[PDB]
Amino acid sequence: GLVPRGSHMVGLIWAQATSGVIGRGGDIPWRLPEDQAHFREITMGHTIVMGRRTWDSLPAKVRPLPGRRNVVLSRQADFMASGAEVVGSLEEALTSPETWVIGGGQVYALALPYATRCEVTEVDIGLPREAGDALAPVLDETWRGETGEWRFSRSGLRYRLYSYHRS
């Protein structure tokens, strides 16, 4: 369903291991080129919001991510994010009619209360939670959605898509 242009739809999009781990050591601890396609179709043409550490983690060749207004949250007023804009709190990050929050653990948690969509890729990889991991936010009982079927990636890694929504 289309978003009325006077409203403010906030979505979260992430990929996680079964354990909920999304990030470790400044990176994502798997590679899934198929997940990149889904990420692009959801976010293309909209504003994307990310934490400063997620900006740092982006491959240099796609930083800023093309075809999307890139917004970076930082408390560092002098932060350099070429091709993007830096905001110092959530207030001015969510003023577009459609915004996708693209990570990381801190900024998913910050934006979750305002979100009405989550697009979640689950990767069937056994990565037990460790000290310092970035984690998927916990979804409360207001959320509902659909669980997709497992598929193998070319590499043999298994993954499936969840699409969640709430009012």
Ligand X SMILES: CCc1nc(N)nc(N)c1OCCCOc1ccccc1CCC(=O)NS(C)(=O)=O
Which residues lie near ligand NAP (CB under 6 A)? Answer: 14-15, 22-24, 26-28, 50-54, 57, 73-76, 79, 88-90, 102-107, 110, 134
59 binds, among ligand NAP, ligand X, none (CB under 5 to 8 A by kind): ligand X
Known binding residue 117? Answer is no
Residues of this chain, 1-60, that bind ligand X according to CB under 6 A: 13-15, 28, 35-36, 38-40, 54, 57-59
Q: What distance in Å separates the CA atoms of residue 117 and residue 145, rounded to the nearest whole number?
A: 9
Q: By the 8 A CB rule, do 84 and 65 touch?
A: no
Residue 78 or 146 with smaller CB distance to ligand X: 146
76 binds, among ligand X, ligand NAP, none (CB under 5 to 8 A by kind): ligand NAP
Tokens of 124: 């069937």
Query: Comparing C-alpha atoms, which of 118, 106, 117 is closest to residue 56?
Result: 106
Q: What distance in Å separates the CA atoms of residue 94 and residue 76, rounded to the nearest whole number?
A: 19
Residue 33 or 126 with smaller CB distance to ligand X: 33
Tokens of 158: 């298994």
Q: By the 8 A CB rule, do 104 and 50 touch?
A: yes
As a residue count, the chain comes to: 167
12 binds, among ligand NAP, ligand X, none (CB under 5 to 8 A by kind): none
Residue type, 137: P
Known binding residue 73? Answer is yes
- The H or E element that residue 162 is part of is strand 158-165
Residue 41 or 78 with smaller CB distance to ligand X: 41
Residue 6 or 55 with smaller CB distance to ligand X: 55
Q: By the 8 A CB rule, do 55 and 72 touch?
A: yes
Task: List binding-site positions for substrate.
Answer: 13-15, 35, 40, 68, 108, 121
User: Which residues of the chain form contacts with ligand X (CB under 6 A)?
Assistant: 13-15, 28, 35-36, 38-40, 54, 57-59, 62, 65, 102-103, 121
